[PDB]
Amino acid sequence: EDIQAHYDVSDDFFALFQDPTRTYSCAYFEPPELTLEEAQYAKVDLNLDKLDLKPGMTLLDIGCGWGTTMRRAVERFDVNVIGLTLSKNQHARCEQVLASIDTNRSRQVLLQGWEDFAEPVDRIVSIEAFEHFGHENYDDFFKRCFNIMPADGRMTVQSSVSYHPYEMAARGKKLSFETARFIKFIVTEIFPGGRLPSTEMMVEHGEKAGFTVPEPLSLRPHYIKTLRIWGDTLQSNKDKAIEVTSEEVYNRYMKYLRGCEHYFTDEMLDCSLVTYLKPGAAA
Ligand SMILES: c1ccc(CC2NCCN2)cc1
Ligand SMILES: [Mg+2]
Ligand SMILES: [Mg+2]
């Protein structure tokens, strides 16, 4: 706990490498010449367009960040929204983002985890929160998501993934041990207590809960471009980043950002956008 708190970093530091929306997830460069900011909106659209959202439905955002996904959903689809975050800062910002919207739709932000959320919702989106949940909680997660949705329910989960050690060993022993050590660094120093799933885990746990799971979308090339821009931006802001934190924290995040770009490029990490369809989902 204390040792993990050593890895707490100011929101101000994150602002020195992210786009103006402060999206801390894979952008979607379609078309390829989008700015990072436009690509973060495109990634939100990529997720929401999979969810068969109709006016007056309620969308649940599990890990709602700074509220960008929820705002886009209200504005584009005329839906009610509920977001879950455990960040007090993100909670306050989401309430202000949603209050700003010209709408009669209900907007709610809860400072709580999915474990404590048991209200009926139409559709669920979760963008790069899943890596915090832990393997032993995946069955409870998919069961909760299945049970709170109607017969035509759908969910997207976007998550960074690694491969089963067996599969990693297939793509060179030297690279398997080197990748495992970097993943340990990610889930120790960058996201304390994190644990990467595999795409196969994300699929099989959904199926066991009763979801239909089509072929997941790989975002690998998009995450490479995202991490290149994040790294280039942090580096261009080096002095300011050291002033707000320390040389230690700057070096840690340069290692994270360049490191991830490398292991994504070498196809030892991936990013999967998995769609989960309830049996009564529209065709
Ligand atoms: C391990 C734990 C959490 C995460 C989620 C995440 N947050 C920002 C970008 N990825 C990834 C990997
Ligand atoms: Mg902000
Ligand atoms: Mg490297």
Residue numbers in the entry: 19 to 301
The authors write:
Among these, MmaA4/Hma is particularly interesting, as it has been shown that it is necessary and sufficient for the introduction of oxygenated modifications on MAs and that oxygenated MAs participate in the virulence of Mtb in mice, modulate IL12 production in macrophages, and trigger the differentiation of macrophages into foamy macrophages in granulomas in vitro. Crystallographic screening of a library of fragments allowed the identification of seven ligands of Hma.
The binding modes of ZT218, ZT260, and ZT585 share common features: these fragments are buried between residues Ile204, Phe209, Tyr274, and Cys278 on one side and residues Glu149, Ser178, and Leu214 on the other side. It is likely that the binding of ZT218, ZT260, and ZT585 fragments leads to structuration of residues 147–153, resulting in folding of the helix η1, as already observed upon binding of the SAM cofactor or analogues. Binding of the ZT218, ZT260, or ZT585 fragments induces a conformation for residues 146–155 similar to that observed in the Hma structures obtained in the presence of the SAM cofactor and analogues. Furthermore, from a steric point of view, the binding of these fragments would not prevent cofactor binding. Superimposition of fragments suggested that chimeric compounds could be derived from the fusion of ZT218 with ZT260 or ZT585.
